[PDB]
């Protein structure tokens, strides 16, 4: 029975690598520029001992140990493909900027559950660093209006920027010493979920269309044209009057007459609109 691990197996695989001297990397980088299959394999495998120390520097972050080392390897493959041997730059110094660039991109795009754009995530990096120094400088809690005066920013701008970091927490994790019920059984819906509320909207819809068919004949088609209660589309006064009535004031005179008639029906029926709207 041998030890089974993930981070331990990768550390032993990179240990069996040859040393990279300065007199040999100049020839390997020269052959990789022309294009060869053996040039990309020997150059990428010799620099595997460098990304392990750079990815381990960003400890206690959103990404794990294997997530930082694997993401840093993509920057090394792109560095050896865009290196300029004629410029005289060091092969190890040119790949350091590409290894550090790919690490910072994965933190601002894979740590939070909501992906933020790049042009707005850089503004929150300087706000967290400014709040860290001001935390120990004042020996108090970091106030939202205190950072606005130090950084010369309005109060309405700092309130939205500092409030963008929601720091969402889990739901299945229950609070308290005893885990008797999680947060899934304490939430409710915003729409109508009760059987009584779903029946009032259905019974009222079947009565509104029924009251219009029994109210009148000529006045029923005018209210249905203004408001699409029978499935028709809503139209304006000028659009509805252009095909019926041939006027803009004839369609409004019948509307007020039919409105006063339906007002008396709901009063004698028992709807009690004076008590509902109050």
């Amino acid at each position: 029975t041998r030890a089974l691990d993930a981070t331990q197996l990768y550390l032993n695989e990179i240990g069996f690598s040859p040393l990279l001297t300065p007199e040999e990397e100049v020839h390997f980088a020269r052959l990789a520029q022309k294009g060869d299959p053996a040039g990309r394999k020997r150059m990428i495998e010799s620099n595997l001992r460098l990304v392990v120390k750079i990815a381990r520097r960003y400890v206690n972050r959103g990404l794990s140990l294997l997530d930082l080392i694997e993401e840093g390897n993509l920057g090394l493959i792109r560095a050896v493909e865009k290196f300029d041997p004629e410029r005289g730059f060091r092969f190890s110094t040119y790949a350091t900027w590409w290894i550090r660039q790919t690490i910072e991109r994965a933190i601002m795009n894979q740590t939070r559950t909501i992906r933020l754009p790049i042009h707005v995530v850089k503004e929150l990096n300087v706000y967290l660093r400014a709040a860290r120094e001001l935390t120990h400088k004042l020996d108090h809690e970091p106030s939202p209006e205190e950072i606005a005066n130090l950084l010369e920013k309005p109060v309405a701008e700092v309130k939205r920027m500092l409030g963008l970091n929601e720091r969402v927490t889990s739901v299945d994790v229950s609070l308290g010493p005893d885990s008797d019920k999680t947060l899934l059984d304490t939430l409710t819906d915003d729409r109508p979920t009760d059987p009584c509320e779903l029946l009032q909207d259905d019974d009222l819809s079947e009565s509104i269309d029924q009251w219009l068919t029994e109210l009148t004949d000529k006045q029923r088609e005018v209210v249905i044209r203004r408001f699409g209660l029978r499935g028709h589309e809503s139209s304006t006064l000028e659009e509805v009057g252009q095909e019926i009535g041939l006027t803009r004031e004839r369609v409004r005179q019948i509307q007020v007459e039919a409105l006063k008639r339906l007002r008396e029906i709901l009063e004698k029926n028992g709807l009690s609109s004076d008590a509902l709207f109050q």
Partner: protein, 47 residues
Amino acid sequence: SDDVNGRTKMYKNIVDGDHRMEAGMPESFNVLIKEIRSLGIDIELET
């Protein structure tokens, strides 16, 4: 309890006056089907 269409259709039967007692389907078992099929194990109804 544990229904969507059964509770709404039963409330109309009480107001109408006749208890039809629709069958419906419990919501405690419909969630278990979606959680089992997402684990790589198949489940179906032969009927």
